[PDB]
């Protein structure tokens, strides 16, 4: 029997964790004068077999939902119910973009309980998780510095003002970009990394990438998106046969640098 309540789909391949699409169906909507950020598209699974969590994605400076676009459908097809958000102004900053990301969230929850919608009854509210590119990366460890409760996050190139995110809790997969000019890795994915010493943690730097590394149209897609999903659902659902794929080194020449802490696949 299964005995995780918040397991769903099928026992995870590596294969099956690296197709553009995973086993469940997507459908989505656009939300229409947001509660507190400034547009959204809502991914949800028609037939994930239960409720399911919530993951709310902001794109860097300047940026769209076509940036982080692609992670709505990926992660949707495995079980989640993701928003992808345009900010307020493109020029808003991370504390900003966290404060949006956490209105995405809370909307998400409020549409569960909304009769009309079509995520009516598809979330598990106490269940959720942040995502970002840059500035909207900084905002997720913003989010997760004030929110302990938030299950997991998966930032990519991110930024903020600070790297001490000594206080996060929340098991946190950083996505760098080895070349990353705009934020550079040494200057702000890995300090930000270093910092946090309260947490499951990962650091998972492509080789050759630029700041753009992780949007959508990248050339990794079966790399970073199989431990997109590995992590959300390790730690999102708790579901341990995702394990291996959440914590390994992706014994992969597409990574430059890997680290990882409190992911442990060993027994001492």
Do not use: D, E, F, M
């Given at each position: 029997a299964q005995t995780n309540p918040y397991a769903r789909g099928p026992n995870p391949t590596a294969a099956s964790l690296e197709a553009?699409?995973?086993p469940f169906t997507v459908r989505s909507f656009t939300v229409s004068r947001p509660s507190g950020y400034g547009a959204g598209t809502v991914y949800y699974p028609?037939?994930?077999?239960?409720?399911?969590?919530?993951?709310?994605?902001?794109?860097?400076?300047?940026?769209?939902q076509s940036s982080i676009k692609w992670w709505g459908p990926r992660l949707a097809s495995h079980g989640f119910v993701v928003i992808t958000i345009d900010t307020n102004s493109t020029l808003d900053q991370p504390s900003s973009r966290s404060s949006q990301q956490m209105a995405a969230?809370?909307?998400?929850?409020?549409?569960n309980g909304t009769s009309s919608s079509p995520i009516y009854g598809k979330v598990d509210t106490a269940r959720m998780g942040v995502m970002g590119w840059s500035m909207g990366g900084g905002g997720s460890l913003i989010?997760?510095?004030?929110?302990?409760?938030l299950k997991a996050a998966a930032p990519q190139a991110p930024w903020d003002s600070s790297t001490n995110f000594s206080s996060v809790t929340v098991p946190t997969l950083i996505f760098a970009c080895e070349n990353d000019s705009i934020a550079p890795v040494?200057?702000?994915?890995?300090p930000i990394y270093d910092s946090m010493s309260a947490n499951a943690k990962q650091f998972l730097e492509i080789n050759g990438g630029s700041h753009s590394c992780a949007?959508?149209?990248?050339?990794?897609?079966?790399?970073?998106?199989?431990?997109?999903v590995a992590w959300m659902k390790r730690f999102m659902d708790n579901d341990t046969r995702y394990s291996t794929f959440a914590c390994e080194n992706p014994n992969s020449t597409r990574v430059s640098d890997f680290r990882?802490?409190?992911?442990?696949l060993e027994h001492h």
């Open positions: 553009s699409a995973g028609n037939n994930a077999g239960g409720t399911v969590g919530a993951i709310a994605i902001v794109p860097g400076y300047t940026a769209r969230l809370r909307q998400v929850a409020s549409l989010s997760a510095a004030n929110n302990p409760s040494n200057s702000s994915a890995l949007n959508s149209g990248n050339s990794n897609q079966a790399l970073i998106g199989k431990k997109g990882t802490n409190n992911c442990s």
